[PDB]
Amino acid sequence: DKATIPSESPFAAAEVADGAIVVDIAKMKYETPELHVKVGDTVTWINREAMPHNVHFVAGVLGEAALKGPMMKKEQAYSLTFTEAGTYDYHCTPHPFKRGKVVVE
Ligand SMILES: [Zn+2]
Numbered sequence: 001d002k003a004t005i006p007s008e009s010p011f012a013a014a015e016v017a018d019g020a021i022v023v024d025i026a027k028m029k030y031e032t033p034e035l036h037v038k039v040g041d042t043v044t045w046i047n048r049e050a051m052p053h054n055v056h057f058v059a060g061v062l063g064e065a066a067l068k069g070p071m072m073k074k075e076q077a078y079s080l081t082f083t084e085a086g087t088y089d090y091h092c093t094p095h096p097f098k099r100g101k102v103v104v105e
């Protein structure tokens, strides 16, 4: 598997480290729809809207099974640590037309 999960459930945005790699979730888009990180980096998504959103990697992308992230409320965060190089597309489960990617290099 190509990513590990530091926290199975969403956590408070106030707990995200200074300097962290962050993708804000907005209504109309993940604010960084194509993010490049280094192998071993942790990416943190933070929901900035009241509408719940998540991140969802379909089966085959981070491994054999899908990785459907938990639904995040406003000012909640969720992190993934990417352990192999590759390009990993994801989307928001309830709003599947909103999509992003992480390029790990
Ligand atoms: Zn790059």
Ligand SMILES: [Zn+2]
Binding pocket: 052, 053, 054, 092, 093, 094, 095, 098
């Ligand atoms: Zn959404």
